[PDB]
Design a protein around this ligand. Structure first.
Ligand SMILES: [Zn+2]
Ligand SMILES: [Zn+2]
Lengths: 75, 380, 381, 75
């Protein structure tokens, strides 16, 4: 659920900072061009906000958890 | 649906009077213990409201991008749903460039976002206020007063696609009208009429506490009501419009053309500026005076018919011309009272807006109230 | 009941407009509790307000009647109608204006007179709606002041009439009531925004935005009747001089036709009907009076468009007869003076109900059934 | 039960017409002042409507039955 969620942002090489609030998944990338809008939304996202250089994936309560699942897909 | 209008109506309540218990929401908002208690339950689980018997609103982590396009400048700022200010920009816009405008506006917004990429806590929507004829439904600016290049601009569709949040198109005038009612001069009033008199002419109206919209949310183009059947062409395609006679530029253009002829004016020496005209109209100059009077008389006649339609409490003027208020105001009132249902005009007073230079606020709160933005915010 | 009242009037509203709907459809549309739907529905089913099309529910209106009567200048029009507002019988009486007996009581008499003669056609009396010009306290049914009948002053013609019959009395201003009456039944149906100008013994117009009738100040109804189109004109009973209603009022238009007939040109006495007909045939003198009105109304209705942008503009007046000569004038104006992007898709059309049709209270009773403040009383029989 | 109804409405020398709906008991009368509305309610009327000279007494289903009672009681 999270290994394909890191690819939806481009990949460990494009995600500069992985973060998440209560219901969103505010992740800051290096290149928005590489952000997969479909895959994110076809994985649970109710909307993808691309304000500037930071994406905000709308998944819900699973967000606070998903940010953790994606950080483990490095180690 | 009914879910959107029923959901946004409980929110509309919880913010107008904080706090209010699940009982006042069921009662004051006309709703059963099932469709008034559970409607808050999902708003609490989405943090649009706050706990503590009493229910208030949570508006700090929610933000929205607001921007205004002036005759030549793009102002930016992020705000809470309470309309508080987080950060504001001052980027120049200019007229001609390599790229059109729509693409230029996008870069501007994108810039604003990378710098202040740490202030943002959660984006809900974006609200723009610019001049010209607009479709709003699709947000297609047709034509504009200072960018003859702009022809059918999908600003609404484009800015949404480039972010993922709803776009709100409105005029600098409407927005400012709600602002005056929220902290300006009409704060506390239920029926106001606000006229703007700058590079664009227009008027925002507040009916029974609500900001008057138009048919299909099409905006009030009161500035395009013909006042002179022989006047000059207007970007709306018509001619003789109000925006064509009372537009500050036209005033000076009319003064300037009449100066270029056989005429006297304590304005011959000092070059013509919006300040210099009033400053000279007050000293008694037959020219500057009569230009403003007329200006006043042209806005008053229209404003007289609006008095008969809305019978407002307060009438506000927002213009650099309010420097020569003792010539303007007294004329607009004289036009109001001589051609409007007395009982309506015999307890009305023209006063100047106590603010200058806006920001969505009205379109974003109302976006919450209608429940449109609320439903999309309930999953986020 | 308190929410059971609105909760009830919502299910009725859905069945009156969307019927035949299913119990399920209703629980889905009204968004109310499933078992809560079956309760309300069953009550209406038992009190005979709705019936099963044998799943399949559709209002029952034939057996219930209401009295819709509008009082406009020395004439009272009384009719009995269905809860669908279909009429049964209509009749127009008199009122003289001045009389040894107050108006308050003369009105009650006609109502009694009307009922007596039509006691075999009348079925279940549900209520009476009254529409009239004047300043009306609608939530208390008290006529404060009223044109035509000088001696009025605070007339509880709603409370006394409610006691004398024992059914609810709904009283609304003539134009406001008519405007929404058109919006539900006729002309401007299916429009959220609507401007309806009314031109008769008194000029004024009503407007609807978003889906609500527009009010001002207090109730301060829209008064475009007093918009000085002529900086001189005559003296108006309001204060100014030259008010729209000094040129456009049917009485003036007729004083103008007359005081302009004394100087050459007809045949039969001068009436609004004979005027329009003359202008209809091709007479240039009557045509000039009609066009003249449209010049003025047009100017005002021009700015009224840049403000509201209605889907429909309606003209309520005996002059809708001369449609061919007056409307085009209003249209040009609106097309020459309001914003092109607005005046594009919008035509000045005629009002569907005459200035005399009892159909003006058609909405008062519908608002009563929807808001529930009646479907609850009728629920008992 | 039937004779009380006749009395409340003013007795046979006042009832000019007597009919019944599915839920009401419509009865015309020569003089509305001679009609005891208070009683009509006490007997079981939910409400009493006076439209001109015809008194509508709301009884309900039990209305077409009472019109038959009152009818034979006038003989
Ligand atoms: Zn124009
Ligand atoms: Zn007047």
């Amino acid at each position: 659920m999270a290994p394909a969620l890191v690819a939806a942002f481009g990949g460990k090489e494009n995600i500069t900072n992985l973060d998440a609030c209560i219901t969103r998944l505010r992740v800051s990338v290096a290149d928005v061009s590489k952000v997969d809008q479909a895959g994110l939304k076809k994985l649970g996202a109710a909307g993808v906000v691309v304000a500037g250089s930071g994406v905000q994936a709308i998944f819900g309560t699973k967000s606070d958890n998903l940010k953790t699942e994606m950080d483990e897909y490095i180690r | 649906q009914i879910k959107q209008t029923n959901a946004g109506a409980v929110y509309r309540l919880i913010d107008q009077l904080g706090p209010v218990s699940r009982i006042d929401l069921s009662r004051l908002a006309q709703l059963a213990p099932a469709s008034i208690t559970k409607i808050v339950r999902e708003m609490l689980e989405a943090h649009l409201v706050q706990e503590l018997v009493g229910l208030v609103v949570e508006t700090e982590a929610w933000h929205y991008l607001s921007l205004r396009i002036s005759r030549g400048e793009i102002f930016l700022a992020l705000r809470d749903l309470s309309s508080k200010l987080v950060v504001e920009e001052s980027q120049e816009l200019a007229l001609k460039d390599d790229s059109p405008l729509l693409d230029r506006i996008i870069s501007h917004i994108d810039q604003f976002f990378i710098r202040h990429q740490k202030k943002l806590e959660r984006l809900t929507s974006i609200a723009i206020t610019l001049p010209g004829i607009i479709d709003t439904e699709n947000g297609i600016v047709h034509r504009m007063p200072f960018y003859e290049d702009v022809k059918e601009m999908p600003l609404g569709e484009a800015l949404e696609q480039h972010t993922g949040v709803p776009v709100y198109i409105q005029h600098d005038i409407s927005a400012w009208t709600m602002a005056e009612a929220l902290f300006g001069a009409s704060r506390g009033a239920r029926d106001v009429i606000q006229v703007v008199i700058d590079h664009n002419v227009g008027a925002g109206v507040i009916t029974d506490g609500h900001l008057l919209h138009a048919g299909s949310s099409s905006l009030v183009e009161i500035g395009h009501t013909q006042v002179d059947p022989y006047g000059k062409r207007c970007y709306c395609g018509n001619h003789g419009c109000l925006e064509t006679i009372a537009s500050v530029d036209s005033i000076l253009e009319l003064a300037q053309l009449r100066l270029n002829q056989s005429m006297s004016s304590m304005l011959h020496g000092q070059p013509l500026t919006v300040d210099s005209l009033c400053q000279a109209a007050l000293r008694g100059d037959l020219l500057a005076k009569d230009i403003i009077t007329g200006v006043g008389a042209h806005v008053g006649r229209i404003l007289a018919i609006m008095v008969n339609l809305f019978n407002p409490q307060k009438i506000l003027i927002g213009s650099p011309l309010s420097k020569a208020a003792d010539i303007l105001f007294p004329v607009i009132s004289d036009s109001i009272r001589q051609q409007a249902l007395p009982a309506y005009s015999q307890h009305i007073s023209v006063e100047s807006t106590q603010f200058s230079n806006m920001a969505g606020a009205a379109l974003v709160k109302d976006a919450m109230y209608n429940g449109s933005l609320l439903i999309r915010l309930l999953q986020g």
